[PDB]
Amino acid sequence: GPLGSRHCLSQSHRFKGMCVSSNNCANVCRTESFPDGECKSHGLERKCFCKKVC
Amino acid sequence: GPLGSRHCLSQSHRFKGMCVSSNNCANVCRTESFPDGECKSHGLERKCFCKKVC
Fold first, then answer.
1. What's the topology of domain B1-54?
2. What pairs make up the disulfide bonds (chains A, B)?
3. Which among A10, A40, A42 has the least Cβ separation from residue B54?
């Protein structure tokens, strides 16, 4: 399929606590004007990262 | 940050091998049309992430 856009991530400003639903993260990120978002782990911390085209 | 610009990260397309020096990562990222870059660890990988204002 078509050559896709490159994506950029930024940790959520609003999301609270452990990120264990990427759908919930994506919706919180929509309140921050990003179209998408996903949970990511670093060590034992799971955080919400908002996602847009760079 | 909070009273500054919000920044976005995108894993480098061109950077090869383990990211040791964030200066080297930033320079490779400049060839990718990002103004900055930095090494970040996840799992047993240290990778170069290009960095711009969202």
1. Defensin A-like (3.30.30)
2. 8-54, 19-39, 25-48, 29-50
3. A10
